[PDB]
Structure 1
């Protein structure tokens, strides 16, 4: 499908690709070098791991990148082929991978969750008092803004960490939202409250991403 295309820019076709599934189609296996990572993993984990890397390899193949194992590195972050970047996400009913060429794309962060209210207490634990106040006013009451905030915080971390290799807690970023007049999609900009020093290039002070609610899921993505 093309749900995640709703939260990506349209201009980078040569240096950005994506792939998604809504299930774990029987038959997929990990590459030989990936199997030790799930040898002792629960069934749910084996499946999401295998399926999402299948998607990652379809996206890479669209960009002329031969298949390759995708291991986990610093703090669980995925290890991409030479010259490539990307992000992965899996939740109930969704698996998604977005990859890009490092020259044109500097980093990717994506996240997917079911469009449902947050469980008890997690909201206060992932949001600043100013966000809880400003956010609900910016979008319709049909949306679970708490969950959308959540996904945007996680997308911000995924885009941020490969570039700094430093922790970004939920209180270290202020995110602001804006909805387009369809009522189900929009934008957000994440303003960094701590040192944005990166290992290469200019520091990160703002991350502009997109969000939408498609087919009962929330999707967010940042493309630097």
Structure 2
């Protein structure tokens, strides 16, 4: 799988690269997409099937994944996880809450960002440092964005608060083999959480493979 390259029972994952015919949403999920265009219906159904395949590995019966007030997925009792969908990719990573405090994942096409988007998602220090820490010709702007998204998705279930693109400063390293590596997101705002210690540093991994960027953060419980 692509997502295994960015991950460290207590943790499980599943991914698909298309929308298989014959998948349906669970009844509890169906209203959430009753009025949605086909592309949205399909990604929603497929990514939630991935989540249930992952939850099944952790011993959890098939269950609906509803959405909270800020769109965040609602996991079965005792579980945490993250979802992502982009062109050519649907993925889920889930964890047992006793061992895994939070998960955030993201996938994007490995393309340059559209003009004007980089300034909206980066800090000036990231634009200055990432060219020095990443292999030439990779789309470090898109990889940075992918890491910002994983950072938010791991942050929000623990804080239930906004995190802006300027509120996390992300430093990157590259592995010797050149298409994977580590990142560290440092939170620049108050990181108080609903329980447990505050969020200040979140360590993740990135990977470029088959035209996709994958990023993931798994915070130990």
TM-score, with structure 1 as normaliser: 0.97
Report the Cα distance in structure 2 between the residues aligned to 1:88 and 1:194, rounded to whole angstroms. 25
Hey, which bits of structure 1, 4+ residues long, moved more than 4 A?
none
**Cα offset, 1:141, TM superposition:** 1.3
Tell whether 2:192 aligns with 1:197: yes
Coordinate RMSD, CA, aligned: 0.5
Question: After superposition, what is the alpha-carbon deviation per residue over 1:12-45, rounded to whole angstroms, capped at 9, x for unaligned?
Answer: xx00000000000100000011000000000000
1:114 positional shift: 0.3
Please, which runs of 5 or more residues in structure 1 have no aligned partner? none
Aligned-partner SS, 1:106: strand
Report the CA distance between 1:74 and its aligned residue: 2.7
* 5+ residue gaps, structure 2: none
User: How big is each residue's C-alpha offset from its partner over 1:74-108, in whole Å with a ceiling of 9 and x where there is no partner?
Assistant: 31000000000000000000000000000000000
Offset from partner CA, 1:110-141 (integer Å, 9 cap, x none): 00000000001000010011110011111111
* Map 1:54-133 → 2, pairs under 5 A: 54-133=49-128
1:178-203 deviations in whole A, cap 9, x for unaligned?
00111100000000100000000000
With the length of structure 2 as denominator, give the TM-score of the two structures: 0.98
Q: How many residues align?
A: 219
Whole-angstrom distance in 2 between the partners of 1:47 and 1:197: 36
Shift of 1:142: 2.5
